Design a binder for these strands. Sequence first.
RNA 1: GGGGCAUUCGUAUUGCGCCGCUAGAGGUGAAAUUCUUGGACCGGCGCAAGACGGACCAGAGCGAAAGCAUUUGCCAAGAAUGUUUUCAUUAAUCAAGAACGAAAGUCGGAGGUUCGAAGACGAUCAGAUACCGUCGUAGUUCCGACCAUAAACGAUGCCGACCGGCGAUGCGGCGGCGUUAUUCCCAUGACCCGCCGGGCAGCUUCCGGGAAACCAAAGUCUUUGGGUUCCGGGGGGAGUAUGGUUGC
Lengths: 134, 99, 19, 82, 58, 213
Amino acid sequence: GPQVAEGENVFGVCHIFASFNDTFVHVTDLSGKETICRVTGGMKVKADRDESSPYAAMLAAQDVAQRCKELGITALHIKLRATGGNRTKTPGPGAQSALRALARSGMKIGRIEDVTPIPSDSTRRKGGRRGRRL
Amino acid sequence: TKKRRNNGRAKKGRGHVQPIRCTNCARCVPKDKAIKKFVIRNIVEAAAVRDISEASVFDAYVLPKLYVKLHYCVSCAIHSKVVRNRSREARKDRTPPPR
Amino acid sequence: MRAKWRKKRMRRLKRKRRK
Amino acid sequence: PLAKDLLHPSPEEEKRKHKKKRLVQSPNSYFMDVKCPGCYKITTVFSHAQTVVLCVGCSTVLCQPTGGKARLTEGCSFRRKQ
Amino acid sequence: PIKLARVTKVLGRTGSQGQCTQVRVEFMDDTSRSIIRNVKGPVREGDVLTLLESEREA
Amino acid sequence: VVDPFSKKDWYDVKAPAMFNIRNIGKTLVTRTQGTKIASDGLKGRVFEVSLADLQNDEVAFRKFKLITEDVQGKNCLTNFHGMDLTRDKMCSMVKKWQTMIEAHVDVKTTDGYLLRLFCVGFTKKRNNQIRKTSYAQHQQVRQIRKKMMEIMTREVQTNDLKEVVNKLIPDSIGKDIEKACQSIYPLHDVFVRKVKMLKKPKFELGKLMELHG
RNA sequence: GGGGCAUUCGUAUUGCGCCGCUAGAGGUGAAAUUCUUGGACCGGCGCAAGACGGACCAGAGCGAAAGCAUUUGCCAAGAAUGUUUUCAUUAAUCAAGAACGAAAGUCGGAGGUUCGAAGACGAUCAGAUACCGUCGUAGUUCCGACCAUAAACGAUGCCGACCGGCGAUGCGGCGGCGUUAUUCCCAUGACCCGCCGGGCAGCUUCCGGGAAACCAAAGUCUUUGGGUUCCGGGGGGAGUAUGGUUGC
Ligand SMILES: [Zn+2]
C-alpha cells in the first residue's frame, strides 16, 4: 500500500494486553489512533478454558502478522500490558507465545516496553478484607 | 505457647502498621508481616531470546526487564510453596536461601 | 459453640426479654 | 573483672567515662582567653558557650552558639587557661 | 510445514504417571536450533522426531 | 463488503529542527469524504518516539512525546508536547537502601508555553562506605529539593522551547543538579523524570514553520 | 510518617463527548447470570468526580495510648543531647474526679469514585439459607453531635538500685589519620575509626531464675521485707438475674 523503498522498514505499534481470562494482540500506526488489526484468543479457539492459552495467543499473533504483511507494515513496536490497576501486574501466559509468534512470522521487533497501568494509592480491590477463599 | 519471639512480624517500638493486599487472593495483611518477593525477570525467557535477536532491526539491543514486587499472605505464601515450615531450631535462622 | 456467638445469642435473648 | 582498683582508676579511663558517672565529678568544659586579630584587649569565654559574644574593643563577633562547644571566628586564636 | 529434529540429550521424565519424557531437540533444516519438547514412548540420543507443530513449548 | 483500508492515505511525519533523524514514519488516515478534512484527523495526533530514534548516537531511555500542529500536502508538521522516561529505567533506578528525592515545578517559557517539570534523584553509596543504608535527613532532603527546584526554575524560565529541548537532549538540567547538590549530599542518578505541556499559545504557522526551518 | 489549619501534585479507578477497526467481551476449577452490529471489549485525544498516597518503606522514626508517609507555607507543642545557668526537695505511685480513645454503630447536614453488611440472581451441592461469580441498599469519605468498647497484646503496671560479654542501628555531643564536593587555606557537608548519654531491637552465655516453653529479666524468692496502685482464689451457672447509674 504505502509507496516506500523495498529496503526501508515501515513501522507500527503492537499493543499486547495479556490477562488470565484472554490475550489481546492489537496492531496500530505510530500514533495509536488509526488501528490496523486486533485478534484475541476468543476468535481462534471456541473454549472459554483456552481463551488465554499460549496456543490461542500464538494463532492470534500469526493471523494478525499474516494480515499486516498485506498492508505493507514490516516492523512493530511491542507494548506488553497486564490487567494492572488494583489487580495483578504480572503478564498472562499468552504474552511470550504471542511475541514468539510475531517474531517467527517475519515481522521485525522494534522497542519492547511494559505499559501496565501502575497506580499510586488506588481504590479498594475487588476481594473482601479476608479475601478470596478458593 | 509463644511460637515466634517477634510474633511472626517486624513491628517493634511501634503501634499500628498500615495494611496491604495479598497479590494472589487479595487478603488484607499488615505490611510488616507480609512475605515480600521482589522478582526481576527478563521480558523474554532464554528459550525465546534467540528468535528476537535476528528479528530485531537494532544490533546489540539490550532486552528490557520487568520489576514487580509481589506481596503474599501466609495462607497463599505456604500454598504457593515460596515458603514452607521449618524445624524449631532452623526457624531462628533468618539468612535468605543462597542461589 | 464459639464464645463470640454465645455472646450474640445472649444479646438477642436480652433484647426480646426487655421488650 | 574481679581485681580492679575502684579506688585508683587510670587517668585515661577516668576522662573517657561520663562526667556524672566519674569516681569524683568534674566538668569536661573549661575557660579559655581569646586574642582577636583586629584588637589588643583580651577577653575570657566559656568552652561551651551559649551567647554570641561581642568584643566591645572593636565590636566584632567572637564565638557562635552550637549544639556543643562554641565555634570561634577565623583569625581569633583561643588558648587554655590553667 | 512438517519438519524433523534430532535428539541430543534426554532432560528428564514427566507426566502424572511418568508416561512421557522431556527432551531437547536440534532441528534438521537448521543446524543450531534447540527447543524443549515432551514425547510419549521410549527415546534415546540420536532418535529423530517428526514435529507436526514446531512452535509450541514444554 | 467494502475494505476501509482501500480508502486510506499514508502521510509522512517529520520531527522539528531540534532532532537529527527528521523522518519518524508513516500514518494512514481516511480520505476526505467532504464533511470532514483528512488534516482534522491528523491535527491532534501524538507520537511517543525514543530519543535514540531522533538523535543517532543518543541514549534510548528518554522518550519524547510530539504532537502534530499542521498538515502540508502529504507531509505532517509536529511540535514538542512532553518528555517521558521509559518504565524499565525508572524501575531499575529505585533501590531498597537509599533515599529517593522527587521535585515537581510549574514554569512559563518566554515565548509562552507552560511546562510542569518533575525531576527525581537518589542518594549515592560511597566507594569506601561500610554502612548498609545511605539515607539523607529531612532538612538535607528539603535543601536538595529547594536546590533542584530553583535550578529547574532558573534554567527553563529565561529561554524558549527551541533552547529548552536542546537543554533536555543531553539532560544538562540533571548534570547541573548532580554537580550543585554534591555539597549537601552526594546524588547517584538525577534525571528530569517527566515534562508535561500544560497550556499552549494561540497557534500561528510562521513559528511552527521556523521550528522546521 | 508527632498534632491542627491552609495550599499543591501524582498515577490509577469509574462515568461522559469525539475518532479508528471491529465480533465477541467479563468472569470461573468448569460454567452461567451480565455488557454487546442502536456498535461492546481494545487503541488515541480531552473533560469531570470522589477515593487513596504505590515502589522509596527497614525487626527504621515519632506519639500517653489509639495512631501517624505527596509538595510548600503558617500556628503551638515535645524527647534526647550540651551547659563551671537558675529555683532548692518542689518527689514516687494513686480512691474520688478528669483528657483522649481503632473498627463498627446512632442522629442531623454535604457528596456518592471504588468496595460492599442487607437483599436480588447465576453456579456448586443430597441440601447451601454459605464458600465461587454478576449486580446492589445502609455503610465506606467530609463537617457538627453522641457511643467508650477490640487478641485496645509485649496476653508482661509505674518509679528507683545492682548484676556478663558482642556487633549493628537512630538522635545529639566529644576526639582523630585519610578520601572526596563547595576551586584552593581553614570551615561546613558525604564517608571512615573510636568514645559518651538516652532510645528501637538482635546475637551469645551453666549470672540466676522457671513446671517447662523460655526470660539479661519473667534475675537479685524459705539466704523469703526498696516505694506504691489495680487485681485472681477448682470447673460450670455467668459477665447471667435483679437493683442502681450513663445513653436518643
Ligand atoms: Zn492471599
